[PDB]
């Protein structure tokens, strides 16, 4: 009759074919990432090409279905999701140029070398030749030159690349009814279709600003605090009032801050919790590490992991003979194929990433019910947070005690809490300023509201006004620093690692509210209950069938990024940071010059 029945029929056919096409393509991709050879490398080509071709051909057809007569919401969202040609809105030549330039980015990140200026022979690369230099080697000039040379090389080798890439992606997003590729990314939160649940595509910036000035006090506190000890280390370069120098930071870029753990640890006498030697002297292997994570998810009431998972996964580096990728990832191929890819050295951290990846899975396993276009997390943000509240609820002393993985006499004193909360803060409140600054810079660089001739100037200006980090030397616009970050010149929506942060703590409190919990948020577990699992499941098994605001409201009762609960989680550290800051200058100025003599 009307376009409704024709749409429904087309969706039936598209599902029943796309499932198998995707399965075969992704299983080829899997077999590559487990058994890298030339054979499986080639075999990745044909199936991926087949999938991309099916998508092109079957999307071009679903445009005669003009969305004016779609009354039912499910089909409306489905067609709205399928009617995107990705980058196809370009002519074939521009699309070729775009994939070419993207691959230049990917490879020029995979390569890239710098040779020490006094050691013209020890010439290393970003990955594990430069990471360990700028993680623990405390000598100032060493890391200074390391960071400097990396930025300089990748700048001279990437500035024109990103320079033209911005214009190309901008024209692409322009051809698909979007102001800029920044609007393209933002359109990932554009969820709508109910009473008030309509979340616009521009409201995102408003919620970001609203949610970031509320967290600013904690981060200024912790920044001044860390600056105290980092000035105690080098009382010759750190400024008593200005922001701390860039290169002398935790990781390569400053995005994470857990690498600067010892130089500014709290009182260095308390035993930081870890159970490496504990199960190491009990003789646990990878499979026993995962047995416990599965037991944790089956306790809370989430579904029991499946038998195909245990025989097809890659729990541990096999005997030898094969060249693996060695990076933990959760593959869900489809059709009920759930697999985990990771090299498992018995360790505390490889005991929490277990929980994280199995959370990724336990999510992908719940929404294996929707019609295959509603098979992504409620948005691009819920996913890396569902597999994260399970991690943070596994680092409590109470959990480790329950399984008896540490001495069953631990006292859980104040100092333990403070050291642990600072440990977690140096990543969770350290990633937020840089993430937000970088994403607010990309958003301002797509919209052309800043000159192409002026990209690094305002870049470092925002860096030092919203993150609190000054550049070691004043680079000119012959460089393009932030492209150096992996997530920049590899086309990933990076605001994802912002939102989930807020999200997870929100989620945390939600379960802790229903899990009948009393104490401080940070000292909480979720196991040995059912409602604390089912109240998550009710949103877990929806995909993006429903506009993410409703899915969110099913568990939190709120409707937006609502960061009260984060500051509640870091409340003890908030107080103790205040107390350690009774005689410091919370805040910074911008006058430190690299060299004004």
């Amino acid at each position: 009759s009307l376009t409704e029945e024709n749409a429904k029929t087309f969706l039936n056919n598209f599902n029943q074919e796309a499932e198998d096409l995707s399965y075969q393509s992704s299983l080829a991709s899997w077999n590559y990432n487990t058994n890298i050879t030339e054979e499986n490398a080639q075999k990745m080509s044909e199936a991926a090409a087949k999938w991309s071709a099916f998508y092109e051909e079957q999307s071009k057809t679903a445009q005669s279905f003009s969305l004016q007569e779609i009354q039912t919401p499910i089909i409306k969202r489905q067609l709205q999701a399928l009617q995107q040609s990705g980058s196809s809105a370009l002519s074939a030549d521009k699309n070729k140029q775009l994939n070419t330039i993207l691959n230049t980015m990917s490879t020029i990140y995979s390569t890239g070398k710098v040779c020490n200026p006094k050691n013209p022979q020890e010439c290393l690369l970003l990955e594990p030749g430069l990471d360990e230099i700028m993680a623990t080697s405390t000598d100032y000039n060493s890391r200074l030159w390391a960071w400097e040379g990396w930025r300089a090389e990748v700048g001279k080798q990437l500035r024109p690349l990103y320079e033209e890439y911005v214009v190309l992606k901008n024209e692409m997003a322009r051809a698909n009814n979007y102001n800029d590729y920044g609007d393209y990314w933002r359109g990932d939160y554009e969820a709508e279709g109910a009473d008030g649940y309509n979340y616009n595509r521009g409201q995102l910036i408003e919620d970001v600003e609203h949610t970031f000035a509320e967290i600013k006090p904690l981060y200024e506190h912790l920044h001044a605090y860390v600056r105290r000890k980092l000035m105690d280390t080098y009382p010759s370069y750190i400024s008593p009032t200005g922001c701390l120098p860039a290169h002398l930071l935790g990781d390569m870029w400053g995005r994470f801050w857990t690498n600067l753990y010892p130089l500014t640890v709290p009182f260095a006498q308390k035993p930081n919790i870890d159970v490496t030697d504990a199960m190491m002297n009990q003789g646990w292997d990878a499979e026993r590490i995962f047995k416990e994570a599965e037991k944790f998810f089956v306790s809370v009431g989430l579904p029991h992991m499946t038998q195909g998972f245990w025989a097809n996964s890659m729990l541990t580096d096999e005997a030898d003979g094969r060249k693996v990728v060695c990076h933990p990832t959760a593959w869900d191929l489809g059709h009920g194929d759930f697999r985990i890819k990771m090299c498992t050295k018995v360790t505390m951290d490889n005991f929490l990433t277990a929980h994280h990846e199995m959370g990724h899975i336990q999510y992908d396993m719940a929404y294996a019910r929707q019609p295959f276009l509603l098979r992504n997390g409620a948005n691009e943000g819920f996913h890396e947070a569902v597999g994260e509240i399970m991690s943070l609820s596994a680092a409590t002393p109470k959990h480790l005690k329950s399984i008896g993985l540490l001495p069953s006499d631990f006292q859980e004193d104040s100092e333990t809490e403070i050291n642990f909360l600072l440990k977690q803060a140096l990543t969770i409140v350290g990633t937020l300023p840089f993430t937000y600054m970088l994403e607010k810079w990309r958003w301002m660089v797509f919209r052309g509201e800043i000159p192409k001739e002026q990209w690094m100037k305002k870049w470092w200006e925002m860096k030092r006004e919203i993150v609190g980090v000054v550049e070691p030397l004043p680079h000119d616009e012959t460089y393009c620093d932030p492209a150096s970050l992996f997530h920049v010149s590899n086309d990933y929506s990076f605001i994802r690692y912002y939102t989930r942060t807020i999200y997870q703590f929100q989620f945390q409190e939600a379960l802790c509210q229903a899990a009948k919990y009393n104490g401080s948020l940070h000292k909480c577990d979720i196991s040995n209950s059912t409602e604390a699992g089912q109240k998550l499941l009710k949103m877990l098994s929806l995909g993006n069938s429903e506009p993410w605001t409703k899915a969110l409201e099913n568990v939190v009762g709120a409707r937006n990024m609502d960061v009260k609960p984060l500051l509640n989680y870091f409340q003890p550290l908030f107080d103790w940071l205040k107390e350690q800051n009774r005689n410091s200058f919370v805040g910074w100025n911008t006058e430190w010059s690299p060299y004004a003599d």
């Binding site: 029945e5 024709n6 039936n12 399965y23 195909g308 059709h335 009920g336 194929d337 759930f338």
Partner: protein, 194 residues
């Protein structure tokens, strides 16, 4: 007055696609379903008639035995009244049906790596089918009202699709072989004994 090919129905190695489900009428059996009942290896023994006991004790007139192949999560669809993706386009039992539905996951046998494409199932059709009536047809399905004259194109689709099995699947997407025993008693002197 002898045992009859129940085994030859079950232990065959060529089970036919769901839509083209073959049927092997059996007659004049000294039939012992209990050497079936005590298998304890089937994935689905849901009976809709009399207990295995009274089956073994009573002699019926004539029996019919269906056999086909479907994914895992569709062994519940073969049942007296159940809608679904196939369920009424490939094999739709009636309302008072009085036979049993045997089903077993033989993943290893029926599903070879790379894809055992030789199994077909009929997707969207014009109308809901009836008891026991197979549909072998392959006439193109006309979505709207535009004529396409027997070539799949814009809003013109092929009914028979195929779910390519594999061994690396879920417990619900694997080839669950199924066999349906439909009995009936009429005015004729009952033949299949036990």
């Amino acid at each position: 007055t002898n045992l009859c090919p129940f085994g030859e129905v079950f232990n065959a190695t060529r089970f036919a696609s769901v839509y083209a489900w073959n049927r092997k009428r059996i007659s004049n059996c000294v039939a012992d379903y209990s050497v079936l009942y005590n298998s304890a290896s089937f994935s689905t023994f849901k009976c809709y008639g009399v207990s295995p006991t009274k089956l073994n004790d009573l002699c019926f007139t004539n029996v019919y035995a269906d056999s086909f192949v479907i994914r895992g999560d569709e062994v519940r669809q073969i049942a007296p009244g159940q809608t679904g993706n196939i369920a009424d386009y490939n094999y739709k039992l009636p309302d008072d049906f009085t036979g049993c539905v045997i089903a077993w996951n033989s993943n290893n046998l029926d599903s070879k790596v790379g894809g055992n494409y030789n199994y077909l199932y009929r997707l969207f059709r014009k109308s809901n089918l009836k008891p026991f009536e197979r549909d072998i047809s392959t006439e193109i399905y006309q979505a709207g009202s535009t004529p396409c004259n027997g070539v799949e194109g814009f809003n013109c689709y092929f009914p028979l699709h195929s779910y390519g099995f594999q061994p690396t699947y879920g417990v619900g997407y694997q080839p669950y072989r199924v066999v349906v025993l439909s009995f009936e008693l009429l005015h004729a002197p009952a033949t299949v004994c036990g």
